[PDB]
């Protein structure tokens, strides 16, 4: 606990990438001691899973993908802020997709953490920034990825 | 093929401003490259055994004592590809290089190569022999030692690999 997680890659959103790299570029100009996040994403849910349950996760993901039009709407990124040692963005528009895939996962006997604040990691620092992107999700990007 | 003598540039806030702005442009274009964190100019490479450290420190110190002979302008320009790294050309360390090499040799340290020495400042290293977009950098740092600052600063260093 945890173990793997279900990921939503943001690298595809050329709109989001534009202002994301711009914010990272800004971190560099200030000369902060940071590690820049290379492949920006949003972790939809953590999992505690054994390899003999991978297929379940597939079907769980498969189910959401099929009914994807239900989860259309706007994704918004805003309010940069610290989260321990990470600079992070607030993500909003994945709440419905989150709680659905958690049900399905538990109904398949996948422990998936029900209880969740959706963020996007920007930079890891060793020890008032402004950002806003409103992304039309509209009309498959979901991965099982292992930690880490 | 062993050790090198280093001139760190991080204390030059003027140079640093422009060098971060250049690195920032790299990040903004989204390039697969690893930025350098402690910019520096390699002054010479040497083949040194760990019992020649004392004699290296002494050469470095011998130059530092005559640092006023090298006062002038470090000029940084021409961001260009040099192998896999993006790299700035550096000018103003030519005598300092010659001299510390001479010192190091009579101290019995083997330094430099027979090939022409060309001094650079590394901006970023790429993954696979990438491309020089029309990158543009120019800066002139004054290189002088202070007189009303007995707090002095940084300078030459001997580093591993």
Coordinates of C-alpha atoms in Angstrom, one line a residue:
Chain A
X1 CA 0.0 0.0 0.0
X2 CA 0.3 1.6 -2.4
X3 CA 2.0 -0.1 -5.4
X4 CA 0.9 0.8 -8.9
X5 CA -1.5 3.6 -10.0
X6 CA -3.7 4.6 -12.9
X7 CA -2.3 7.5 -14.8
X8 CA -3.7 10.2 -17.1
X9 CA -0.9 11.5 -19.4
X10 CA -1.1 15.2 -20.2
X11 CA 1.7 15.3 -22.8
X12 CA -1.0 15.0 -25.6
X13 CA -2.6 18.3 -24.7
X14 CA -0.5 20.7 -26.8
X15 CA -2.5 23.5 -25.3
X16 CA -1.6 22.6 -21.8
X17 CA 2.0 21.8 -22.7
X18 CA 2.5 25.4 -23.9
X19 CA 1.8 27.1 -20.6
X20 CA 3.2 24.2 -18.6
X21 CA 6.7 24.5 -20.2
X22 CA 6.3 28.2 -19.9
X23 CA 5.9 27.8 -16.1
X24 CA 8.8 25.4 -15.9
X25 CA 10.9 27.8 -18.0
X26 CA 10.1 30.5 -15.5
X27 CA 11.3 28.3 -12.6
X28 CA 14.6 28.1 -14.4
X29 CA 15.0 31.9 -14.9
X30 CA 14.6 32.4 -11.1
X31 CA 17.4 29.9 -10.6
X32 CA 15.6 27.7 -8.1
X33 CA 17.1 24.4 -7.1
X34 CA 14.5 22.2 -8.8
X35 CA 14.0 18.9 -10.7
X36 CA 11.6 19.6 -13.5
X37 CA 8.9 17.0 -14.1
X38 CA 9.5 15.5 -17.5
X39 CA 6.2 13.7 -18.3
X40 CA 3.3 15.7 -16.9
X41 CA 0.4 13.6 -15.7
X42 CA -2.5 13.2 -13.2
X43 CA -2.7 10.1 -11.1
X44 CA -6.4 9.1 -11.3
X45 CA -6.0 6.5 -8.5
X46 CA -3.4 4.6 -6.5
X47 CA -3.7 0.8 -6.4
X48 CA -2.5 -2.0 -4.2
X49 CA -2.5 -4.8 -6.8
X50 CA -0.8 -8.2 -7.4
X51 CA 0.3 -9.0 -11.0
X52 CA -2.5 -11.6 -11.2
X53 CA -5.0 -8.7 -11.1
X54 CA -3.6 -6.8 -14.1
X55 CA -6.3 -8.0 -16.4
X56 CA -9.0 -6.6 -14.0
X57 CA -7.4 -3.2 -14.1
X58 CA -7.4 -3.5 -18.0
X59 CA -11.1 -4.2 -18.0
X60 CA -11.6 -1.4 -15.4
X61 CA -9.8 1.0 -17.7
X62 CA -11.5 -0.6 -20.7
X63 CA -14.9 0.1 -19.2
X64 CA -14.2 3.8 -18.6
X65 CA -12.7 4.3 -22.1
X66 CA -15.8 2.8 -23.7
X67 CA -18.2 5.1 -21.9
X68 CA -15.8 8.0 -22.3
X69 CA -18.4 10.5 -23.6
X70 CA -19.9 10.5 -20.1
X71 CA -16.7 12.1 -18.7
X72 CA -16.5 14.8 -21.2
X73 CA -16.4 18.3 -19.8
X74 CA -13.7 20.8 -18.9
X75 CA -10.4 20.0 -17.2
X76 CA -9.0 23.0 -15.3
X77 CA -5.4 23.6 -14.1
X78 CA -4.8 26.4 -11.6
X79 CA -3.5 27.5 -8.3
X80 CA 0.2 26.5 -8.2
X81 CA 1.3 25.8 -4.7
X82 CA 3.6 23.6 -2.6
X83 CA 2.7 20.0 -1.5
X84 CA 5.6 19.2 0.7
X85 CA 8.7 19.3 -1.5
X86 CA 6.7 19.5 -4.9
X87 CA 5.4 22.5 -6.8
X88 CA 2.0 21.4 -8.0
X89 CA -1.1 22.4 -10.0
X90 CA -4.8 21.9 -9.0
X91 CA -6.7 19.7 -11.4
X92 CA -10.5 19.7 -11.7
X93 CA -12.8 17.7 -14.0
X94 CA -11.7 14.2 -13.2
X95 CA -13.9 13.7 -10.1
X96 CA -16.6 11.7 -11.8
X97 CA -14.1 9.5 -13.8
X98 CA -12.2 9.0 -10.6
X99 CA -15.1 7.7 -8.4
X100 CA -16.4 5.5 -11.2
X101 CA -13.1 3.7 -11.9
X102 CA -12.7 3.2 -8.2
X103 CA -16.1 1.5 -7.9
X104 CA -15.4 -0.8 -10.9
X105 CA -11.9 -1.5 -9.4
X106 CA -13.3 -2.5 -6.0
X107 CA -16.1 -4.5 -7.7
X108 CA -13.3 -6.4 -9.4
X109 CA -11.6 -6.8 -6.1
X110 CA -8.9 -4.2 -6.7
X111 CA -8.0 -2.2 -3.6
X112 CA -8.0 1.3 -5.0
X113 CA -8.2 3.9 -2.2
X114 CA -11.8 5.3 -2.1
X115 CA -11.9 8.0 0.6
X116 CA -8.4 12.3 -3.0
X117 CA -7.0 15.6 -4.2
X118 CA -6.2 15.6 -8.0
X119 CA -3.0 17.4 -8.7
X120 CA -0.3 17.8 -11.4
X121 CA 3.4 17.8 -10.4
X122 CA 5.5 20.5 -11.9
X123 CA 8.9 20.6 -10.1
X124 CA 10.5 18.9 -7.2
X125 CA 12.4 21.4 -5.1
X126 CA 15.4 20.2 -3.0
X127 CA 14.2 22.0 0.2
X128 CA 2.9 33.3 -6.1
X129 CA 3.4 31.8 -9.5
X130 CA 0.1 32.0 -11.5
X131 CA -1.3 29.4 -13.9
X132 CA -4.6 28.7 -15.6
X133 CA -5.6 26.4 -18.4
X134 CA -9.1 25.3 -19.2
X135 CA -9.0 22.1 -21.4
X136 CA -12.0 20.8 -23.3
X137 CA -11.6 17.1 -22.6
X138 CA -14.2 16.1 -25.3
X139 CA -13.5 13.2 -27.7
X140 CA -8.3 7.0 -24.8
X141 CA -5.4 8.0 -22.5
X142 CA -5.1 5.8 -19.4
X143 CA -2.3 3.6 -18.3
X144 CA -1.5 1.1 -15.6
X145 CA 1.9 2.2 -14.4
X146 CA 4.0 0.6 -11.7
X147 CA 5.8 2.6 -9.0
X148 CA 8.0 3.9 -9.9
Chain B
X1 CA 42.0 11.6 -19.0
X2 CA 41.8 11.8 -15.2
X3 CA 41.2 15.1 -13.4
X4 CA 40.5 18.7 -14.4
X5 CA 41.0 22.2 -13.0
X6 CA 37.8 24.1 -12.8
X7 CA 36.8 27.8 -13.0
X8 CA 33.2 28.1 -11.7
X9 CA 31.0 30.7 -13.1
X10 CA 28.1 30.6 -10.7
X11 CA 29.3 33.6 -8.8
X12 CA 29.0 35.9 -11.8
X13 CA 25.4 37.0 -11.4
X14 CA 25.5 39.0 -14.6
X15 CA 26.6 36.0 -16.7
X16 CA 24.2 33.8 -14.6
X17 CA 21.2 35.9 -15.5
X18 CA 21.7 35.4 -19.2
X19 CA 22.7 31.7 -18.9
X20 CA 19.5 30.9 -17.0
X21 CA 17.5 32.8 -19.6
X22 CA 19.1 30.7 -22.3
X23 CA 18.5 27.5 -20.4
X24 CA 14.9 28.7 -19.8
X25 CA 14.4 29.1 -23.5
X26 CA 15.5 25.5 -23.9
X27 CA 12.9 24.3 -21.4
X28 CA 10.2 26.5 -23.1
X29 CA 10.8 24.9 -26.5
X30 CA 10.4 21.5 -24.7
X31 CA 13.7 19.8 -25.7
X32 CA 14.9 16.4 -24.5
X33 CA 17.9 17.8 -22.6
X34 CA 19.5 17.8 -19.2
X35 CA 20.5 21.3 -18.0
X36 CA 23.8 21.9 -16.3
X37 CA 23.5 23.2 -12.7
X38 CA 27.0 24.5 -11.9
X39 CA 28.3 26.2 -15.0
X40 CA 32.1 26.3 -15.2
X41 CA 35.0 26.5 -17.6
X42 CA 37.5 23.7 -17.6
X43 CA 41.0 25.3 -17.6
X44 CA 43.0 22.1 -18.1
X45 CA 42.8 18.3 -17.8
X46 CA 45.5 16.4 -16.0
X47 CA 46.7 12.9 -15.3
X48 CA 47.2 13.0 -11.5
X49 CA 47.7 10.4 -8.8
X50 CA 46.1 11.1 -5.4
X51 CA 49.6 11.9 -4.0
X52 CA 49.9 14.8 -6.6
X53 CA 46.9 16.6 -5.0
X54 CA 49.3 18.6 -2.8
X55 CA 51.3 19.7 -5.8
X56 CA 48.1 20.6 -7.7
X57 CA 46.8 22.7 -4.8
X58 CA 50.1 24.5 -4.8
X59 CA 49.9 25.4 -8.5
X60 CA 46.4 26.6 -8.3
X61 CA 47.4 28.7 -5.4
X62 CA 50.4 30.0 -7.3
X63 CA 48.1 31.3 -10.0
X64 CA 45.6 32.8 -7.5
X65 CA 48.5 34.8 -6.1
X66 CA 49.0 36.3 -9.5
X67 CA 45.4 36.6 -10.4
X68 CA 45.8 40.3 -11.1
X69 CA 47.9 39.4 -14.2
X70 CA 44.8 37.9 -15.8
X71 CA 42.4 40.7 -15.2
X72 CA 40.3 41.5 -18.2
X73 CA 37.1 40.3 -19.8
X74 CA 35.7 36.9 -20.0
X75 CA 33.6 37.0 -23.2
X76 CA 30.8 34.4 -23.7
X77 CA 29.3 33.9 -27.1
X78 CA 28.3 31.5 -30.0
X79 CA 25.9 29.0 -28.5
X80 CA 26.6 26.0 -30.8
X81 CA 26.6 22.2 -30.8
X82 CA 29.8 20.5 -29.6
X83 CA 29.0 16.8 -29.7
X84 CA 25.8 16.2 -27.8
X85 CA 26.1 19.3 -25.5
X86 CA 25.0 22.9 -26.3
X87 CA 28.0 24.9 -25.5
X88 CA 29.2 28.6 -25.2
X89 CA 32.6 29.7 -26.5
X90 CA 34.7 31.3 -23.8
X91 CA 37.4 33.9 -24.3
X92 CA 39.7 35.5 -21.7
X93 CA 41.4 32.5 -20.0
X94 CA 44.1 32.1 -22.6
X95 CA 47.1 33.2 -20.5
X96 CA 45.7 31.8 -17.3
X97 CA 45.5 28.4 -19.2
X98 CA 49.1 28.6 -20.5
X99 CA 50.5 29.7 -17.2
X100 CA 48.8 27.2 -15.0
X101 CA 49.9 24.5 -17.4
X102 CA 53.6 25.6 -17.1
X103 CA 53.3 25.8 -13.3
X104 CA 51.7 22.3 -13.2
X105 CA 54.4 20.7 -15.3
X106 CA 57.5 21.8 -13.3
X107 CA 55.4 20.7 -10.3
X108 CA 55.6 17.3 -12.1
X109 CA 51.9 17.1 -13.1
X110 CA 51.1 16.1 -16.7
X111 CA 48.4 18.4 -18.0
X112 CA 46.6 19.4 -21.2
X113 CA 46.6 17.6 -24.5
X114 CA 48.7 18.0 -27.7
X115 CA 45.5 19.0 -29.5
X116 CA 44.6 22.7 -29.6
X117 CA 42.8 23.8 -26.4
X118 CA 39.5 25.3 -27.0
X119 CA 37.6 26.6 -23.8
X120 CA 33.9 26.2 -23.6
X121 CA 31.0 26.6 -21.2
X122 CA 28.4 23.8 -21.3
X123 CA 24.7 24.9 -21.3
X124 CA 22.9 21.5 -21.6
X125 CA 23.5 18.0 -22.7
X126 CA 21.1 16.3 -25.1
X127 CA 20.1 12.6 -25.5
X128 CA 21.2 12.1 -29.1
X129 CA 23.3 14.6 -31.2
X130 CA 20.4 17.1 -31.5
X131 CA 20.0 20.4 -33.4
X132 CA 21.2 23.9 -33.1
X133 CA 18.2 26.1 -33.5
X134 CA 19.3 29.7 -34.1
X135 CA 20.4 30.1 -30.4
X136 CA 21.8 33.5 -29.5
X137 CA 24.0 34.4 -26.5
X138 CA 26.4 37.2 -25.8
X139 CA 27.9 38.3 -22.6
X140 CA 31.0 40.1 -21.3
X141 CA 32.0 39.6 -17.6
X142 CA 34.7 41.8 -16.1
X143 CA 37.3 39.5 -14.5
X144 CA 39.2 41.5 -11.8
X145 CA 39.9 40.8 -8.2
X146 CA 38.5 43.3 -5.6
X147 CA 40.4 45.6 -3.3
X148 CA 37.8 46.8 -0.8
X149 CA 36.5 43.3 -0.3
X150 CA 38.9 41.2 1.8
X151 CA 36.0 38.7 1.9
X152 CA 37.3 37.6 -1.5
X153 CA 35.4 34.9 -3.4
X154 CA 35.7 31.6 -5.3
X155 CA 38.1 30.6 -8.1
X156 CA 40.1 27.6 -9.3
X157 CA 39.3 24.1 -8.0
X158 CA 40.6 20.6 -8.7
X159 CA 37.8 18.2 -9.4
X160 CA 37.4 14.4 -10.0
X161 CA 36.8 12.7 -13.4

